């Protein structure tokens, strides 16, 4: 698809076999998801948002399906009020900024 | 311009009379720039995200130059760890996501 920015670019993502609504975010390297248990090893991380930093768990090689598109990559799980799909996965699904 | 997402989508913006780098951010409802002086009035405001919210000055109908593209809109000024160009202005310059 080709999403416009008049409204927040929200889409459906599937991960761990669970379906979630996410926001496409060119403004961030990594992808952050709302708390949700996931399998695998994981290292602790600290990431800074607009109002400060939050602690997250970084999982690697996690398959995440975005709007029908396949992606496998590093996912950060933690206190975020919104599942934000970052650049790495964006490029994985062939997303670009056009103007 | 076709922007890949493999790297930060930074672009030069000319505002007021200053030319600085800002991120084309589709994960932001608003445009936020780092502390600076701007002419005009302004109502205080609190914008938030990961880590919480921050205090910013809201200026409206502010001229902004983003890659030979002229836009006139709302510009929040304050303690942002990054110069952000949000959807309010991205749409103005006719920008979309495609994949
Ligand atoms: C509540 C929820 C349903 C929503 N609210 C909104 C509206 N809001 C609040 C925003 O758009 N808020 C913006 C914002 O921070 N957007 C964010 C997405 C988000 C939205 C809501 C809650 C948490 C994260 C997305 C933005 O690209 C910012 C920009 C940025 C860059 C460097 C330093 C700080 C910030 N990115 C991050 O906060 O990235 C965190 C990281 C990810 N991986 C590593 S750090 C502000 C800049 C204005 C959209 S969805």
From Swiss-Prot, chains A, B:
Originating gene: gag-pol
The identity of this protein, by name, is Protease
Stretches for region Dimerization of protease: 1-5, 49-55, 88-99
Q: Which organism is it from?
A: Human immunodeficiency virus type 1 group M subtype B (isolate ARV2/SF2) (HIV-1)
Described by its record, this protein's role is as follows: Aspartyl protease that mediates proteolytic cleavages of Gag and Gag-Pol polyproteins during or shortly after the release of the virion from the plasma membrane. Cleavages take place as an ordered, step-wise cascade to yield mature proteins. This process is called maturation. Displays maximal activity during the budding process just prior to particle release from the cell. Also cleaves Nef and Vif, probably concomitantly with viral structural proteins on maturation of virus particles. Hydrolyzes host EIF4GI and PABP1 in order to shut off the capped cellular mRNA translation.
Complex formation: Homodimer, whose active site consists of two apposed aspartic acid residues.
Annotated catalytic residues: 25
* Peptidase A2 domain boundaries: 20-89
């Amino acid at each position: 698809p080709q999403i416009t920015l008049w409204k927040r670019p929200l889409v459906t993502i599937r991960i761990g076999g669970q379906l979630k609504e996410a926001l496409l975010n060119t403004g961030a390297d990594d992808t952050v998801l709302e708390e949700m248990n996931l399998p695998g090893k994981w290292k602790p991380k600290m990431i800074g948002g607009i109002g400060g930093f939050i602690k997250v768990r970084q999982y690697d090689q996690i398959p995440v399906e975005i709007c029908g598109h396949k992606a496998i990559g590093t996912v950060l799980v933690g206190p975020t009020p919104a599942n934000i799909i970052g650049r790495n996965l964006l490029t994985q699904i062939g997303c670009t900024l056009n103007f």
